[PDB]
Amino acid sequence: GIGKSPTGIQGFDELTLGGLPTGRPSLVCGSAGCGKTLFASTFLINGVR
């Protein structure tokens, strides 16, 4: 197995089987208005809180 960092989003976390990889870069692609900035924001907020 590999390390994983939960992102607060329960559905996404259980879809990824733990969350985004820990210590590795993750890419969030999508046109304007898809929600990449909010994705990153909740990532950080949930990680801290």
- Least distance in angstroms from the C-beta of 42 to ligand ADP: 10
| Contact residue for Mg ion among 3, 37, 40, 44 (CB under 5 A) | 37
Distance of CA 37 to the CA centre of its chain: 11
> What span, in angstroms and rounded, lies between the C-alpha atoms of 3 and 21?
6
Looking at 35, 44, 45, 47, which residue binds ligand ADP (CB under 6 A)? 35
Q: Which of 17, 27, 29, 38 binds ligand ADP (CB under 6 A)?
A: 38
Q: Minimum distance between the CB of residue 41 and ligand ADP, rounded to whole angstroms? A: 8
Quote the CA–CA distance of 28 and 1 in Å, as a whole number: 23
* Phi and psi, residue 27, nearest 5°: -110, 130
